[PDB]
Amino acid sequence: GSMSSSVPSQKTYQGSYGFRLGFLHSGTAKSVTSTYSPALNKLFCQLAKTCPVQLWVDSTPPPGTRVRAMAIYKQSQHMTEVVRRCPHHERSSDSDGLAPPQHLIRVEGNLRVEYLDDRNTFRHSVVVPCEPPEVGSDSTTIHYNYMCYSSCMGGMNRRPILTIITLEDSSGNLLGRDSFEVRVSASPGRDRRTEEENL
Ligand SMILES: *C[C@@H](C)C(=O)n1cc(C)c2c(-c3ccc4c(c3)CCN(C)C4)cncc21
Ligand SMILES: [Mg+2]
Ligand SMILES: [Zn+2]
């Protein structure tokens, strides 16, 4: 376990541009590879499958704006432990060539992706340029991939995580923040349906 001496803020912050996340409304059929529970504010997804996350604003942010994703453990007693891939998957060398093998969160389909091992906090994050919607689209979507199961021993080790999405300007200053819980499992639709029944 790499231990950090800080914890990233999780405070929701729409900021000047009205930043917030959206998710597809995918339902809980057996065939779904990712599904989002609004009641739990929790994303359920399969290992290394595309998770679309929409980025919404009310006004266009300045040029060079970027969007960063970072995972932390949800439980207070684990929050200072850096979220990382388990030993097996890190050594599996399943990298797309861009992502460090230790990083839990990847972005797919974006050649401008940038990965950070923070030299002071030791936290991992992934950042991409933030684009307005393309011609013929009404949304900006990032395709995230979670590269370990929540049950991966020596990684998340059955502990729940939060993903924190931050909108930043070109200089790294905070423009907006949103977050959601994540469970990575082989049966996201069933797992979402079950957890919502336990409400
Ligand atoms: C970097 C991302 C957050 C960004 O600059 N961004 C995302 C979105 C969705 C967006 C818009 C935008 C907002 C709302 C609508 C539309 C575009 C298109 C039409 N529908 C109805 C609403 C604008 N600028 C930037 C931006
Ligand atoms: Mg929300
Ligand atoms: Zn793993």
Nearest to 114 by CA among 136, 93, 130: 130
Cα(168) to ligand 1 centroid in Å equals 16
CA dist., res. 6 & res. 4, Å (int)? 6
Q: How far apart are CA 161 and CA 184, in angstroms?
A: 10
| Beta-strand relationship, 114-117 and 174-184 | unpaired
22 C-alpha vs ligand 2 centroid, how far in Å?
7
Structure resolution, Å: 1.7
Distance (Å, whole) CA 147 – CA 149: 7
Q: Which amino acid is at 141?
A: T
Counting from 1 in the atom list of ligand 1, the atom nearest the Cα of 139 is 9
Q: Are 93 and 100 in contact (CB under 8 A)?
A: no
Ligand nearest to the CA of 153: 3
Cα radius of gyration (the chain): 16
Residue 171 φ then ψ, to 5°: -85, 0
Spans of all domains in the chain: 1-199
H or E, element range at 91:
helix 87-91
For ligand 1, residues with CB inside 6 Å are 55-57, 60-61, 65, 130-133, 138-140
